[PDB]
Amino acid sequence: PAFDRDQILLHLSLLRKDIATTRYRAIWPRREDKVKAWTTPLTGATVQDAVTQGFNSYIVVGDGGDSDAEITSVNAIFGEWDDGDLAWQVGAWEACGLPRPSFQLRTGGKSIHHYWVFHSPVDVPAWTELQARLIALAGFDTTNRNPSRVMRLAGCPHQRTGEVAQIFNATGELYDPGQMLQVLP
Ligand SMILES: [Ca+2]
């Protein structure tokens, strides 16, 4: 196998997602090659094919499909800083006044990914407001704001370096969206 299946399933598990309905996106690393992204169900055979061909690996975090209109709920808010010392990125949520992430993800690239997982799926309007407030308070990359946003998948390589994305600092904690709305301005 060209990927770590345990990390893939752990990513889905921590997001309380169902592999049968999870959407995979394979994106070519070099913009100038103008290679079409794959949009397909997440399966081991498809990830195997995309990784060995040279694609980077992503999943749609929200549930329902590939476009914003197809998303009916999202199980987590999440974000990343565009840059900054990596070690600083791991802990910088604390100085922002954010609660501790449910888990974090090392991508192999320039950013740590932070996730806060809710106990129940969140409808798109409520989720959209929480995600926007999270971006504002932390100063995250403002690109990652739409309900069909894809995020780097754990257990697959960052193709530029070969480093395999890894989940770390999982706590098991689940947040409540109403409580989160109070702590996020
Ligand atoms: Ca809790």
Residue numbers in the entry: 6 to 190
What does the paper say about this structure?
All crucial residues cluster together in the catalytic site of the domain. Y63, E85, D87, T112, K115, H118, D146, R157 are conserved across all AEPs (or have biochemically similar counterparts), and their function is well established in the superfamily. Residue D146 along with residues E85, D87 and the dNTP’s α-phosphate coordinate another M2+ ion in the A site, making it possible to add the incoming dNTP to the primer strand of the nascent nucleic acid through the two-metal-ion mechanism. Importantly, in S-2L PP-N190 we noticed a significant positional shift of residue D87 compared to other AEP structures, along with the conservation among the close relatives of the neighbouring residue D88, which is exposed to the solvent. Due to the presence of divalent calcium ions in all crystallisation conditions, we could not soak the crystals with nucleotides which immediately precipitate; transferring crystals to a solution devoid of Ca2+ dissolved them in a matter of seconds.
Among them, cyanophage S-2L is unique because its genome has all its adenines (A) systematically replaced by 2-aminoadenines (Z). We give a structural explanation for both the specificity and the reaction mechanism of DatZ, based on three crystallographic structures, including one determined at sub-angstrom resolution.
